[PDB]
Amino acid sequence: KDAWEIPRESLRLEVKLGQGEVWMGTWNGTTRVAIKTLSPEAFLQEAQVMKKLRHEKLVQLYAVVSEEPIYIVTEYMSKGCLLDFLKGEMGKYLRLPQLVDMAAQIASGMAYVERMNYVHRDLRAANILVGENLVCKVADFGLARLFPIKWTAPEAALYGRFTIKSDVWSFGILLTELTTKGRVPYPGMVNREVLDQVERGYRMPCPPECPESLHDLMCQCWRKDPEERPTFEYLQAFLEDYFTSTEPQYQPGENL
Numbered sequence: 001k002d003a004w005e006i007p008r009e010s011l012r013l014e015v016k017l018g019q020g021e022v023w024m025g026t027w028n029g030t031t032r033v034a035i036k037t038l039s040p041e042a043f044l045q046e047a048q049v050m051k052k053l054r055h056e057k058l059v060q061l062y063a064v065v066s067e068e069p070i071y072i073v074t075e076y077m078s079k080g081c082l083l084d085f086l087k088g089e090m091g092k093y094l095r096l097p098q099l100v101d102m103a104a105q106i107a108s109g110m111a112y113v114e115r116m117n118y119v120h121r122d123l124r125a126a127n128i129l130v131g132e133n134l135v136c137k138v139a140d141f142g143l144a145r146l147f148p149i150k151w152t153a154p155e156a157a158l159y160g161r162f163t164i165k166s167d168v169w170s171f172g173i174l175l176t177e178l179t180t181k182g183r184v185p186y187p188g189m190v191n192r193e194v195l196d197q198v199e200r201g202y203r204m205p206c207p208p209e210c211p212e213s214l215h216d217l218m219c220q221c222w223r224k225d226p227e228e229r230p231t232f233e234y235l236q237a238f239l240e241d242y243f244t245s246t247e248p249q250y251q252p253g254e255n256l
């Protein structure tokens with residue numbers, strides 16, 4: 001055992017958040033935590049990745065209970081996943097400046113993943129968590145190592161070529177989720193149709209009210225050639241600086 005191990009006694013599970021299986025609770029009596037119950041060695045591989053990763057915009061591993069029944073413990077993100085946040089009562093007041101900020105924060109987390117030579121493989125709004133003051137943090141490292149086809153770059157879906165560049169593809173798809181309040185990508189298209197179309201050069205259009213400059217950023221993330229796509233470093237700086245350098249005369253609309 002390493003120094004991330006704790007006694008199971010120290011964990012008070014309370015409110016069930018999700019199943020499939022995450023709980024809200026307390027650790028050592030004072031600490032609000034999230035706890036993920038459950039091959040049990042493939043379940044521990046997630047915590048393995050999470051021990052190596054530490055960044056303000058990645059959900060923080062606190063502790064493991066490496067003996068069955070097993071638990072992974074992290075910081076608690078008060079507002080649940082981005083997907084549900086976007087589609088629920090909060091979503092309707094989110095405008096472009098809040099949404100590009102959330103995206104900058106996600107980009108920043110992924111820039112860290114990029115610097116560390118990791119790949120996420122499951123980057124999407126269902127795998128981002130929201131806290132207080134609209135903090136967004138990259139979650140779910142089950143497929144991370146040193147797939148829903150609608151978010152997955154073609155080379156990775158077909159041939160198994162997952163790289164930081166296919167995460168960049170996924171990020172472009174996540175930007176459509178932000179700007180549509182979390183609608184499923186490629187409306188009215190099934191998986192197979194998405195495959196066929198994307199291969200014939202099809203890309204989703206500019207969502208209503210989304211500046212063309214942001215849609216152009218999506219299209220760059222969606223370059224057929226993985227090496228043509230921008231880095232997260234570029235994405236983070238572009239999105240941080242957006243309302244000064246790229247759309248200085250942005251005007252608020254009904255939806256964005």
Ligand SMILES: Cc1nc(Nc2ncc(C(=O)Nc3c(C)cccc3Cl)s2)cc(N2CCN(CCO)CC2)n1
Pocket residue numbers: 017018022034035036046059072073074075076077078079080081129138139140141
């Ligand atoms: C599904 C969900 N998670 C929430 N917070 C979480 N923080 C961290 C989470 C997590 O899974 N950590 C983790 C673990 C433990 C292991 C490996 C990897 C990881 Cl990343 S889950 C809050 C939440 N709420 C329900 C809806 N409510 C509606 C608001 O009105 C808000 C509150 N629901």
